[PDB]
């Protein structure tokens, strides 16, 4: 075949959902990746290969093998983010069917940073009552605030305690239960996940859905509200390739673009030109790294750090894998800091060993040394994988070239903001919003 519907340029997670989307939607998809593996700029790599990126000289593999395994024991995420068990991305996975090839693991806490140690997020009214996170009274006030989060009701007034979410803000629901400064940070950057403080200021619904979203997805399996894959999240666009297959696509790998091919006068998309040959569609959708001249910097640098330890997080009672949020305040910064950490119970390292990743947005001459913090959390470390990456989102909509790009994966080890990413692409492909049919 020469021509298709659509064709999708990367096997970024991002790409992969949407192609994915569109073949189970009877688009005809050709997919094609410059790179001769699957990933796009969030691929996952052995052990051997992760070395060969990040460090000058890399050690040899006896040295590896002795002290960390065999490669085929590791599956490390470049930018490894968790699933909110019963967010929108659930149930996006779900419907395109991918979730047959990839099984998503429950990973075991959630904790956030408080004045220098990492406590569990309280997700239930038992939890509040235990939590060292608050003082007596607050323990208390922090029960009826989650007990008025389960009861609530639209249609059952008396539910509402008084408060309404869309002309209270969450500052005055806040206020209404008597909640302490320390406790809404970890409501507002945990549980509901904020990046920031202006939800203060505004109608408490997103706060209260997004709050509530957290407590559900927790009682969902019972030890957080996150998922992760077994062997990482590189079974993801290995599950979109085979799927891909079923619907009558192509999942065209290690094939560069040699030219894009435009219409005359309009400068609209009309395909590609390969070693493979030359083919075409009205649309196309592609990470920023095939049209650079099409997206811009948003100003954004992300650190992120791989590293590797021989023994559980201290302070986690040997969690074989857990979130870390780290609030923004609690360092004086103007971002918060990300730990995902996860082991070889899901299959992504060799026995005895860790993985903790650590992200944030830059905003310092010395990015490692922002890390600094987040490190002294982990104990003893064997080994960094430390890069830099720079944030990047289109210069317009795709709406003047049949051109529709996505955006740079953010700081974040969870999976909002890739959503809303894919969610907005495929309102501007199809012109309407996603609704699983």
């Given at each position: 075949?020469?021509?298709?519907?659509?064709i999708?340029?990367?096997?970024?997670?991002?790409?992969?959902?949407?192609?994915?989307?569109?073949?189970?939607?009877?688009?005809?998809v050709?997919?094609?990746?410059?790179?001769?593996?699957?990933?796009?700029?969030?691929?996952?790599?052995?052990?051997?290969?992760?070395?060969?990126?990040f460090?000058?000289?890399p050690?040899?593999?006896?040295?590896?093998?002795?002290?960390?395994?065999?490669?085929?024991?590791?599956?490390?995420?470049?930018?490894?983010?968790?699933?909110?068990?019963?967010?929108?991305?659930?149930?996006?996975?779900?419907?395109?069917?991918?979730?047959?090839?990839?099984?998503?693991?429950?990973?075991?806490?959630?904790?956030?940073?408080?004045?220098?140690?990492?406590?569990?997020?309280?997700?239930?009214?038992?939890?509040?009552?235990?939590?060292?996170?608050?003082?007596?009274?607050?323990?208390?006030?922090?029960?009826?605030?989650?007990?008025?989060?389960?009861?609530?009701?639209?249609?059952?007034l008396?539910?509402?305690?008084?408060?309404?979410?869309?002309?209270?803000?969450?500052?005055?629901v806040?206020?209404?239960?008597?909640?302490?400064?320390?406790?809404?940070?970890?409501?507002?950057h945990?549980?509901?996940?904020?990046?920031?403080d202006?939800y203060?200021?505004?109608?408490?619904?997103?706060?209260?859905?997004?709050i509530?979203?957290?407590?559900?997805?927790?009682?969902?399996?019972?030890?957080?509200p996150?998922?992760?894959?077994?062997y990482?999240?590189?079974?993801?666009?290995?599950?979109?390739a085979?799927?891909?297959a079923?619907?009558?696509?192509t999942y065209?790998?290690d094939?560069?673009?040699?030219?894009?091919?435009?219409?005359?006068?309009?400068?609209?998309?009309?395909?590609?030109?390969?070693?493979?040959?030359?083919?075409?569609?009205?649309?196309?959708?592609?990470?920023?790294?095939?049209?650079?001249?099409?997206?811009?910097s948003?100003?954004?640098?992300?650190?992120?750090?791989?590293?590797?330890?021989n023994?559980?997080?201290p302070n986690?009672?040997?969690?074989?894998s857990?979130?870390?949020?780290?609030?923004?305040?609690?360092?004086?910064?103007?971002?918060?800091?990300?730990?995902?950490?996860?082991?070889?119970?899901h299959?992504?390292?060799?026995?005895?060993?860790?993985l903790?990743?650590?992200?944030?947005?830059?905003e310092?001459?010395?990015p490692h040394?922002?890390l600094?913090?987040?490190?002294?959390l982990?104990?003893?470390?064997?080994?960094?994988?430390?890069?830099?990456?720079?944030?990047?989102?289109p210069?317009?909509?795709?709406?003047?070239?049949n051109?529709?790009?996505?955006?740079?994966?953010?700081?974040?080890?969870?999976?909002?903001?890739?959503?809303?990413?894919?969610?907005?692409?495929?309102?501007?492909?199809?012109?309407?919003?996603?609704?699983?049919?």
């Amino acid at each position: 075949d020469t021509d298709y519907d659509v064709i999708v340029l990367g096997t970024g997670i991002t790409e992969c959902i949407l192609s994915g989307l569109l073949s189970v939607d009877g688009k005809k998809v050709l997919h094609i990746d410059k790179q001769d593996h699957y990933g796009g700029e969030a691929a996952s790599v052995t052990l051997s290969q992760l070395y060969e990126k990040f460090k000058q000289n890399p050690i040899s593999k006896e040295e590896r093998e002795s002290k960390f395994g065999k490669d085929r024991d590791w599956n490390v995420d470049l930018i490894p983010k968790f699933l909110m068990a019963n967010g929108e991305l659930t149930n996006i996975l779900i419907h395109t069917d991918v979730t047959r090839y990839v099984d998503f693991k429950q990973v075991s806490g959630s904790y956030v940073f408080k004045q220098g140690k990492i406590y569990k997020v309280p997700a239930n009214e038992i939890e509040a009552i235990s939590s060292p996170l608050m003082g007596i009274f607050e323990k208390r006030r922090m029960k009826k605030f989650l007990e008025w989060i389960s009861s609530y009701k639209e249609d059952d007034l008396s539910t509402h305690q008084g408060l309404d979410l869309d002309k209270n803000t969450m500052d005055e629901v806040y206020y209404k239960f008597g909640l302490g400064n320390s406790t809404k940070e970890f409501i507002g950057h945990a549980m509901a996940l904020w990046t920031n403080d202006d939800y203060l200021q505004q109608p408490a619904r997103p706060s209260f859905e997004r709050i509530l979203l957290y407590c559900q997805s927790v009682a969902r399996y019972g030890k957080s509200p996150y998922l992760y894959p077994m062997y990482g999240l590189g079974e993801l666009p290995q599950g979109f390739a085979r799927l891909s297959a079923i619907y009558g696509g192509t999942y065209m790998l290690d094939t560069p673009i040699d030219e894009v091919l435009y219409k005359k006068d309009t400068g609209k998309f009309e395909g590609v030109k390969t070693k493979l040959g030359t083919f075409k569609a009205p649309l196309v959708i592609a990470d920023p790294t095939y049209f650079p001249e099409k997206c811009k910097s948003t100003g954004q640098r992300v650190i992120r750090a791989i590293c590797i330890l021989n023994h559980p997080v201290p302070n986690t009672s040997n969690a074989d894998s857990l979130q870390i949020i780290i609030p923004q305040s609690q360092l004086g910064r103007k971002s918060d800091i990300y730990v995902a950490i996860v082991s070889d119970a899901h299959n992504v390292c060799s026995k005895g060993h860790y993985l903790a990743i650590i992200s944030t947005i830059i905003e310092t001459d010395k990015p490692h040394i922002e890390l600094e913090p987040a490190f002294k959390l982990l104990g003893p470390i064997e080994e960094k994988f430390m890069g830099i990456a720079e944030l990047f989102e289109p210069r317009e909509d795709g709406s003047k070239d049949n051109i529709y790009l996505s955006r740079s994966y953010d700081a974040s080890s969870h999976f909002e903001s890739m959503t809303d990413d894919v969610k907005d692409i495929y309102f501007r492909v199809t012109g309407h919003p996603l609704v699983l049919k």
